[PDB]
Design an enzyme around this catalytic site. Structure first.
Site, PDB file in Angstrom:
ATOM      1  CG  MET A   1     -82.823 -20.956 -47.497  1.00  0.00           C
ATOM      2  SD  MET A   1     -84.069 -22.170 -46.991  1.00  0.00           S
ATOM      3  CE  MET A   1     -83.202 -23.721 -47.366  1.00  0.00           C
TER       4      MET A   1
ATOM      5  CB  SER B   1     -81.668 -30.967 -51.693  1.00  0.00           C
ATOM      6  OG  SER B   1     -81.668 -29.679 -51.109  1.00  0.00           O
TER       7      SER B   1
ATOM      8  CG  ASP C   1     -85.100 -27.186 -54.901  1.00  0.00           C
ATOM      9  OD1 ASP C   1     -84.728 -28.308 -54.475  1.00  0.00           O
ATOM     10  OD2 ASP C   1     -85.156 -26.169 -54.163  1.00  0.00           O
TER      11      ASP C   1
ATOM     12  CG  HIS D   1     -81.668 -22.309 -54.434  1.00  0.00           C
ATOM     13  ND1 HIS D   1     -82.746 -23.099 -54.109  1.00  0.00           N
ATOM     14  CD2 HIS D   1     -82.161 -21.069 -54.648  1.00  0.00           C
ATOM     15  CE1 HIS D   1     -83.845 -22.369 -54.117  1.00  0.00           C
ATOM     16  NE2 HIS D   1     -83.517 -21.133 -54.441  1.00  0.00           N
TER      17      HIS D   1
ATOM     18  CG  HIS E   1     -79.834 -27.812 -54.916  1.00  0.00           C
ATOM     19  ND1 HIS E   1     -79.599 -27.049 -56.037  1.00  0.00           N
ATOM     20  CD2 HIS E   1     -80.800 -27.165 -54.221  1.00  0.00           C
ATOM     21  CE1 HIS E   1     -80.380 -25.986 -56.020  1.00  0.00           C
ATOM     22  NE2 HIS E   1     -81.119 -26.032 -54.927  1.00  0.00           N
TER      23      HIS E   1
ATOM     24  CG  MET F   1     -88.468 -21.682 -56.107  1.00  0.00           C
ATOM     25  SD  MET F   1     -87.230 -22.813 -55.374  1.00  0.00           S
ATOM     26  CE  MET F   1     -88.041 -23.139 -53.704  1.00  0.00           C
TER      27      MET F   1
ATOM     28  CG  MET G   1     -83.700 -19.716 -51.676  1.00  0.00           C
ATOM     29  SD  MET G   1     -84.720 -21.040 -51.069  1.00  0.00           S
ATOM     30  CE  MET G   1     -83.385 -22.209 -50.483  1.00  0.00           C
TER      31      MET G   1
HETATM   32 ZN   LIG Z   1     -82.890 -25.136 -53.879  1.00  0.00          ZN
END
Ligand SMILES: [Zn+2]
Ligand SMILES: [Zn+2]
Lengths: 219, 219
Positions: free
Chosen positions: A36, A7, A174, A65, A32, A140, A67
């Site tokens: 966000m 990540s 994750d 990912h 990753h 998650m 978010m």
């Molecule tokens: Zn993630």
């Protein structure tokens, strides 16, 4: 197939290009990227622009990912940026997952979906079964927000459940994944592991990746 | 005093550490960081995390322009991250500017405020005159969103107006500033110039910075 994606959120952001290239060297299958917008989660990290600049330096798989609250609005930019994987959240994706998965797919990106801790696993089966389905599901393993929270073993119930109904679906975990927790998740059915501090804070980063992989393959 | 702050938004994000160090070398006084959450403006750039990683590499002044909706919620993180300047938007900061300016200040950051094109300049005087006032005012010279828009000379009316009432206030212009437009703004009263493509896309970036400065001082 096993997939160990570090990540980048726990890396030296001032040196993405560097960090990214170093992870592949050490074994990174994917990278990753947690995007966000501070509205879906009390935190703002990185957006499309970043992703883009990074694509001009590495051919690695960029697992994005998403978010955010308005995901559909990122599909176009991320595609151009060069994202390899687009993963949205079932919470805000309610009522367009069918159209969404198609927009993503039609752009050349592997579509995926994710569900916070408190979201009944059942909610994704429809998305996992559609004509044009998601190709990966992210579970998650902690409350989404910042890196460094406590691994939640309970969430493993969702991994097993998924793995049972779908034997060859990429399942991603994750949050908190590391040596200390890889096994419990490896046995559950997870095959796509996202690691943060457990890798970027290790004395033997390369080693750590090599250990997460074995775990999964010894399953 | 003159201040030439390049907009890191037009730089090689994969190499911030690099880019940032390179701008100082060429003369950058500050580094303009645009933090957007996609909700206040249809775009998501970078957040605290980034800023933080970057602080571990340079001591330069980090001028943070907060284009978010919930600014108060970034004061704490950015402070820790190491931002030098915290600038919020009068639009969303309506009703707490007094408390906000104080939170910012009490964290060691230079508090600033900004106003989109269509926002009467008068709206900031109260904030510029308070007991604990802002120490800089940013005048958007284009519609906030992405780098590369057309400079709006009309917006200069605001610079002059400000400079008149407040002779020694740092006045910042952001949007389309470059050789072609520095002068019109320099004469208006701007002393803090934010440059994007005019610097990161120049053959003589160093030269460009030296030109923006002269413009201002020759005023
Ligand atoms: Zn993630
Ligand atoms: Zn700005």
């Amino acid at each position: 197939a096993a997939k160990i994606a570090p990540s980048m959120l726990s890396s030296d952001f001032a040196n993405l290009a560097a960090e990214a290239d170093r992870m592949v060297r050490l074994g990174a299958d994917w990278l990753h990227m947690d995007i966000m917008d501070g509205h879906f989660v009390p935190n703002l990290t990185i957006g499309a622009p970043v992703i883009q600049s990074l694509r001009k330096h590495t051919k690695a798989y960029l697992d994005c990912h998403l978010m955010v609250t308005n995901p559909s609005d990122y599909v176009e930019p991320l595609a151009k940026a060069g994202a390899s994987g687009f993963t949205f959240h079932i919470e805000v994706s309610r009522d367009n997952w069918q159209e969404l998965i198609q927009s993503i797919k039609a752009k050349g990106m592997r579509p995926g979906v994710s569900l916070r801790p408190g979201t009944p696993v059942e909610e994704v089966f429809p998305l996992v079964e559609a004509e044009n389905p998601v190709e990966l599901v992210l579970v998650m393993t902690v409350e989404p927000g910042f890196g460094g929270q406590k691994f939640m073993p309970e969430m493993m119930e969702k991994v097993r459940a998924l793995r049972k109904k779908y034997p060859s679906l990429d399942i991603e975990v994750d949050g908190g994944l590391g040596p200390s927790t890889i096994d419990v998740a490896a046995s559950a059915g997870a095959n796509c592991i996202v690691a943060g501090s457990s890798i970027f804070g290790a004395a033997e980063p390369g080693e750590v990746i090599s250990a997460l992989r074995k775990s999964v393959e010894g399953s």
